[model samples]
Target: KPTTPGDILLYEYLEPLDLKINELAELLHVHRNSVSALINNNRKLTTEMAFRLAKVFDTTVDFWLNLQAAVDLWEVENNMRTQEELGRIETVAEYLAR
Candidate 1:
């Protein structure tokens, strides 16, 4: 199963801290709806948001960003046709070496 960044934030961090979405938004200096959307997986995690989350969670921005990337890659991988199409593309490194 694909674990979303929102799921990680909601379960691993916010739930344990007993933090509400609005409170988190205030701490991150973002809008309440933005935080709500992020926590509900309705929005993509941005680099700025990752930084804020990392600051509060004492984690690296990469941690948050990588979680989002994993979910995104998982979604793309599930689409076999897309994967095959992507496989047809030549790598930049390969082109340069040629």
Candidate 2:
């Protein structure tokens, strides 16, 4: 799979924050389709979109772009763990407050 910065940032922010896709879409004031498309790597991020995201997140555009780049690279190397692995990796022992 190709890495997408959008996907990486989305996962990083939302996973820790325990936010759902629907919540993020609503917060960003974009159509769910658009947000989902970007998050699912069906679409590329444009400069304007990046700026919008940066503004909303109170970050710089460079930060978002770099995050996206890092994610894109990571996706090339890691597969989503199997369901079994997910169970193994997500034990109560490792659970923590968000």
Candidate 3:
């Protein structure tokens, strides 16, 4: 996935909870710019922000940290491989042929 941890976690959690960014920002007492920047990959994750996010979601700090690490690792590995070697299916017939 071409997404950061903030993007992935927020997108997944919010949809299930029927929450919007506006609502979350208001509850977190942060400006919409801050929330949007994180979601849109325009800013990096900070320790304080991670703590606030964990509290809001009732999750652990490591959950968010690990997600950030995993995404970075995956991106690095994926970048080193060619598109064809990345195990991506390019077509329906190619998928079935496997």
Best by lDDT: 1
lDDT rank order = 1, 3, 2
Q: Which candidate achieves the best TM-score against the true structure? A: 1
Ordered from best to worst TM-score, the candidate numbers read 1, 3, 2
- Candidate 2 matches the true fold with a TM-score of 0.59
How accurate locally, in lDDT, is each candidate? 0.89, 0.72, 0.77
Candidate 1 weakest lDDT stretch, 10 residues: 1-10
lDDT of 2: 0.72
Per-residue lDDT of 1-98 in model 3, one digit per residue for the tens? 65676676577877788888899898778898888888877777677778888898888988777767777677677774655576674787878798
Candidate 1: which stretches are off by over 4 Å? 87-98
> What TM-score fits each model?
0.80, 0.59, 0.64
Candidate 2 on 1-98: residue-level lDDT in tens? 45575566577787888888788778778888888888877777776778878876788988767766766557555755644466576656568743
Better of 1 and 2 by lDDT: 1
